[PDB]
Amino acid sequence: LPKHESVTLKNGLQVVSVPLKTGVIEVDVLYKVGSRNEVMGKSGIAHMLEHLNFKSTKNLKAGEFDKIVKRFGGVSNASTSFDITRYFIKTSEANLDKSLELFAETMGSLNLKEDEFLPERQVVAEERRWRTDNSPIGMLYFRFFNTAYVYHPYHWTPIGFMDDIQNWTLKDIKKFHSLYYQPKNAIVLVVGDVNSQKVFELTKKHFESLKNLDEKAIPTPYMKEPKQDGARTAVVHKDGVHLEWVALGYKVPAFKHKDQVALDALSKLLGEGKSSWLQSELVDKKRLASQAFSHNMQLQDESVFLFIAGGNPNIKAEALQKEIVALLEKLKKGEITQAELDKIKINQKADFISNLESSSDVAGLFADYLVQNDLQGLTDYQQQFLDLKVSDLVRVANEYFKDTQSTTVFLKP
Amino acid sequence: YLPKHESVTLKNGLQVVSVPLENKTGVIEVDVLYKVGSRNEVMGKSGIAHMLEHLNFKSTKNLKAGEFDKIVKRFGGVSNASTSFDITRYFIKTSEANLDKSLELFAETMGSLNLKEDEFLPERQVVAEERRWRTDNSPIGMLYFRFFNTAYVYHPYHWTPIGFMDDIQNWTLKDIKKFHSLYYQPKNAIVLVVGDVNSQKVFELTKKHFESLKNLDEKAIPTPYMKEPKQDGARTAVVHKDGVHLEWVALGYKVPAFKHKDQVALDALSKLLGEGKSSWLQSELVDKKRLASQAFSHNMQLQDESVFLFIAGGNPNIKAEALQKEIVALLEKLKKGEITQAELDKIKINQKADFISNLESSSDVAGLFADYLVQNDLQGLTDYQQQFLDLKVSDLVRVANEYFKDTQSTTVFLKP
Numbered sequence: 001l002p003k004h005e006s007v008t009l010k011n012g013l014q015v016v017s018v019p020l021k022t023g024v025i026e027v028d029v030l031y032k033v034g035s036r037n038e039v040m041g042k043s044g045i046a047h048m049l050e051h052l053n054f055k056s057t058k059n060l061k062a063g064e065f066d067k068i069v070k071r072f073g074g075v076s077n078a079s080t081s082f083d084i085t086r087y088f089i090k091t092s093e094a095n096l097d098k099s100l101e102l103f104a105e106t107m108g109s110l111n112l113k114e115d116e117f118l119p120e121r122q123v124v125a126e127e128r129r130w131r132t133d134n135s136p137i138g139m140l141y142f143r144f145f146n147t148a149y150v151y152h153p154y155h156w157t158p159i160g161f162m163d164d165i166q167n168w169t170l171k172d173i174k175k176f177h178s179l180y181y182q183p184k185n186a187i188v189l190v191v192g193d194v195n196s197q198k199v200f201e202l203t204k205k206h207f208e209s210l211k212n213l214d215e216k217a218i219p220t221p222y223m224k225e226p227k228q229d230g231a232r233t234a235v236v237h238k239d240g241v242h243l244e245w246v247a248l249g250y251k252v253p254a255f256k257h258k259d260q261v262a263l264d265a266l267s268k269l270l271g272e273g274k275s276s277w278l279q280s281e282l283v284d285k286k287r288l289a290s291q292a293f294s295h296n297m298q299l300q301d302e303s304v305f306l307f308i309a310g311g312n313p314n315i316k317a318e319a320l321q322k323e324i325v326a327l328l329e330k331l332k333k334g335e336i337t338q339a340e341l342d343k344i345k346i347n348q349k350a351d352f353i354s355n356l357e358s359s360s361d362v363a364g365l366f367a368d369y370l371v372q373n374d375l376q377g378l379t380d381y382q383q384q385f386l387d388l389k390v391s392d393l394v395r396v397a398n399e400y401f402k403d404t405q406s407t408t409v410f411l412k413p
Numbered sequence: 414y415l416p417k418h419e420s421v422t423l424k425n426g427l428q429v430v431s432v433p434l435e436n437k438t439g440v441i442e443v444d445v446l447y448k449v450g451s452r453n454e455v456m457g458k459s460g461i462a463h464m465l466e467h468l469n470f471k472s473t474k475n476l477k478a479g480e481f482d483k484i485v486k487r488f489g490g491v492s493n494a495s496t497s498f499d500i501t502r503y504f505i506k507t508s509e510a511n512l513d514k515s516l517e518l519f520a521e522t523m524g525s526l527n528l529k530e531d532e533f534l535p536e537r538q539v540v541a542e543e544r545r546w547r548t549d550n551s552p553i554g555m556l557y558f559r560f561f562n563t564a565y566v567y568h569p570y571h572w573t574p575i576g577f578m579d580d581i582q583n584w585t586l587k588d589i590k591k592f593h594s595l596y597y598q599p600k601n602a603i604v605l606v607v608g609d610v611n612s613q614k615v616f617e618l619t620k621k622h623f624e625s626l627k628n629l630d631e632k633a634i635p636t637p638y639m640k641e642p643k644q645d646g647a648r649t650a651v652v653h654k655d656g657v658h659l660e661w662v663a664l665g666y667k668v669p670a671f672k673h674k675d676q677v678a679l680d681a682l683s684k685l686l687g688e689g690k691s692s693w694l695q696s697e698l699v700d701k702k703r704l705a706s707q708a709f710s711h712n713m714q715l716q717d718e719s720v721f722l723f724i725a726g727g728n729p730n731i732k733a734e735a736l737q738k739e740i741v742a743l744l745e746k747l748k749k750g751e752i753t754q755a756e757l758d759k760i761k762i763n764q765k766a767d768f769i770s771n772l773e774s775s776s777d778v779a780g781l782f783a784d785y786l787v788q789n790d791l792q793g794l795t796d797y798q799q800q801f802l803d804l805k806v807s808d809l810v811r812v813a814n815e816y817f818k819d820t821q822s823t824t825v826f827l828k829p
C-alpha cells in the first residue's frame with residue numbers, strides 16, 4: 001500500500017526509499033546472497049560474513065560499529081537466511097547520514113584480517129556446536145533439509161556443516177565476500193519518516209564512489225532440485241534429548257508462484273495462531289504435543305511447506321505424524337468452514353495495518369520482495385489474499401500435500 | 414602363496430610395482446593407477462574424475478585423438494579403463510614384447526595430455542548421454558544413484574562417479590584442466606606391471622618413460638575432509654519412475670572403512686547372502702519363493718566409511734516392500750546365528766578355488782593389487798587368505814549383528 005521511489009546508481013547499487021511519520025526510520029542494506037550461493041564443503045560462509053561484517057574496516061575498529069550506533073541511541077541487527085543477507089539500523093531521521101556512512105564503511109572498505117578470522121571461526125563453531133548439534137529443534141531443522149533436498153544448496157541450513165566451518169580459509173572468505181558483497185549485488189532500503197529525494201543524494205555521497213570487482217556478472221547457482229519422486233524419511237537418534245520430535249515437509253513452488261498466497265493462508269489456518277488446527281487438536285484437545293506449528297517458507301527457489309511438532313513426554317513421533325496427516329486429510333476433503341476462512345481473512349487485515357505503523361515491519365516486507373524483484377507481487381498481495389475462497393485452499397492442499405512430495409524426520413532419544 | 418613383488422619409488426614420487434609370474438608365458442598387463450575418484454570431487458563439480466577417463470584417450474603431444482587405441486589394437490593389445498569412488502584405473506592387455514610401447518603410451522597421456530576445447534565440448538555431450546541412458550533412464554542405475562544420495566549426506570559418496578546432470582552440464586574446460594593437472598601428477602600415480610616379465614626390465618623401462626615427468630608443485634595432494642557423521646537412524650526414499658515396470662529395492666547398511674579387520678568377514682557374509690547360485694538371496698527369494706527376478710549383495714570395500722549393499726528386483730505384481738520384508742527376515746535369521754558348518758565350509762572351499770584360479774591370470778592378480786596398492790595395504794592383501802580361512806561362524810554372526818542394524822540402514826524403493 002505505501003508508495004515507494006527507487007533509483008539505481010552507476011555501479012548497480014539499487015537505492016529504494018519508502019516514505020512513511022514521526023521521525024522514526026530504518027536504514028537497510030540488503031545483499032542478494034544466502035546459503036543458496038554456497039557449495040558443500042565451503043558452506044556456512046554466508047553466515048560467517050555476518051559476524052565479520054561488524055569487524056574492523058579502514059576507519060572502524062573491531063567493535064567501533066556497534067559502539068557508534070549505540071551512541072546515537074540506535075539499534076542494529078543482522079540476519080542471514082537461505083536467499084538473502086540483511087543488515088539494518090533502526091533509528092531517527094537525524095542519524096540517517098552517519099548510518100549510511102557506517103554501512104558504506106563496511107561494504108567497499110571492509111578488510112578481513114587473520115587475527116579476526118581465527119577467533120570468530122571457533123565462535124561460529126560453538127554456535128554450530130550448541131545451536132544445531134546439542135539442540136532439539138536445531139538438529140531437526142538441519143537434518144530435515146538434508147533429507148528434503150539432495151542436490152540444491154537447500155541441502156543445508158545457513159549454519160552449514162561443522163567440518164566445513166573447521167576447514168575454512170581466509171582466502172575462501174575473501175573470495176566469497178569480494179564476489180557477493182559487490183555494490184551491484186546490494187540494495188539500500190530506507191523506510192520511515194524521511195524524504196526520498198534526500199535519501200537518494202545522501203546515499204550517493206557514500207556509495208557512488210564505491211566500485212565493483214570486475215565487469216562480469218554474478219555467478220548464478222545452477223543446481224536445480226530434481227522433482228521429488230516419492231516420500232523421503234530419516235530418523236535421528238540423539239543423546240541429550242528426552243522428548244520426541246517430528247518434522248513433516250511438503251515440496252512447494254518457488255517465490256513468485258501464484259499459489260504462495262493460498263499457502264501463506266494455509267499456514268495461518270493449520271499451525272499459526274492460538275486458534276490453529278494443530279494448536280487446538282494436538283496441543284489443546286488431544287494434548288499429544290507440547291509445541292506444534294506450521295510455516296510456509298517462501299524460499300527463492302523451490303521451497304517447502306513445513307510442519308514441526310515436539311510431543312509431550314512418552315509420546316511417539318509416529319503418533320504425531322499420523323495426527324498431522326489426519327488433519328491434512330480432513331483438509332484435502334475440503335472441511336473448511338466459512339468462519340475459519342473469514343477469521344483468517346479478518347486477522348490478515350489486522351496484522352497488515354499493524355505493520356504499516358512501524359517502519360521496521362514495513363522494511364521487512366519490501367526487503368524480501370526487493371531481492372526477488374517482485375514488488376508487483378507485494379502490492380497485489382492483499383487483493384489476491386482477501387479474494388481467496390475455500391476452493392483455493394483445497395486446490396493447493398491436494399496439489400502439494402502429497403506423500404510423494406513429503407519429507408518426514410523423526411527425532412528420538 | 415600370493416605372488417612376490419618388487420616396489421620402487423621414482424624421483425617424482427611415482428610408485429612402480431612389478432609382479433612377475435613365471436607360471437605364465439608372454440602375457441602381461443600394464444597398469445596405471447591414479448589415486449583419484451568421485452570422492453575427490455565436490456557437489457556442483459561432480460563426475461569430473463569420470464570425464465577424465467574419456468578425455469585420457471584424446472590427443473597428446475605426439476598422439477592424435479584415438480591414436481592411443483589404434484596403436485594398442487595394432488599390436489593386438491586390449492586397453493580398458495574404469496573410474497570408481499576412490500581409484501581411477503587404466504590398463505593394457507598384451508605381451509612383454511609390447512611392454513615398452515605400452516609404457517610409452519601411458520607416459521604420453523600422463524604428463525603430456527593436452528585438453529583441447531574442441532575435444533572437451535563434444536565429449537561432454539557423450540557423457541551427458543551416458544548419464545541419461547544409464548542413470549536417468551535405467552532401473553538399476555537410478556536405484557544405485559538415489560541410494561547413495563540417501564545413505565550419505567555430507568561425504569562425497571553422496572553421489573556415484575557419474576555425477577549430477579547439471580554438474581555435467583555446467584563443467585568448464587578450466588575446471589577439468591584444474592582437476593586433471595592436480596590429481597594426475599606422478600606423485601599421485603602408480604605404474605603396475607603384472608605377468609611374465611623381469612622386474613629390473615619393468616623398472617628401467619618405467620624409469621625410461623616416467624622418471625623425467627614433472628609434478629605441478631611441492632605441496633601435497635588435498636585430502637578430503639568431509640567425513641560422514643555417524644548414521645543416527647534409518648533413512649528411506651521412494652523413487653517413482655515412468656520407465657520402470659518391476660519394483661526394485663536397495664537395502665544398505667553402513668560399514669567400516671577399507672583397511673578394517675571386519676572387511677574379510679563382510680566379504681564372507683556377501684559370499685553367503687547374495688553371491689553365487691547357492692546364496693541365500695538366490696535359493697530363497699528367486700528360487701524357493703520366486704519373488705525376485707534378481708537378488709544379490711555386495712560388500713563394497715570403499716576407502717572411507719563404506720556400505721554393505723542388498724539389491725533385489727521383484728517379479729511382476731510383487732511390491733518392493735515384500736522384498737524388504739524377506740531380506741530383513743533373512744538378516745534376523747542370520748543374526749540369530751543360523752549358519753551351518755556346511756555353509757561356512759562351502760564359502761571357504763570356493764574362496765580357495767577362486768584364489769588359485771586368479772594366480773594363473775595376470776588380469777586377476779593386477780585387479781587384486783590395484784585395490785590394495787592405492788590404499789597402501791599390501792600387508793592386508795597378503796594376510797587375506799589366512800584370515801578368511803580362519804573365520805568362524807561366530808565371526809560372521811558378530812559382524813552381522815554389529816552393522817546390520819536398522820539405525821545404519823538405508824532403504825530405497827523403485828516404483829511403479
Ligand SMILES: [Zn+2]
Nearest residue numbers: 047050051127
Ligand atoms: Zn548467527
Ligand SMILES: [Zn+2]
Nearest residue numbers: 264296297298
Ligand atoms: Zn513470507
Ligand SMILES: [Zn+2]
Nearest residue numbers: 463466467543
Ligand atoms: Zn563411462
Ligand SMILES: [Zn+2]
Nearest residue numbers: 680712713714
Ligand atoms: Zn572388495
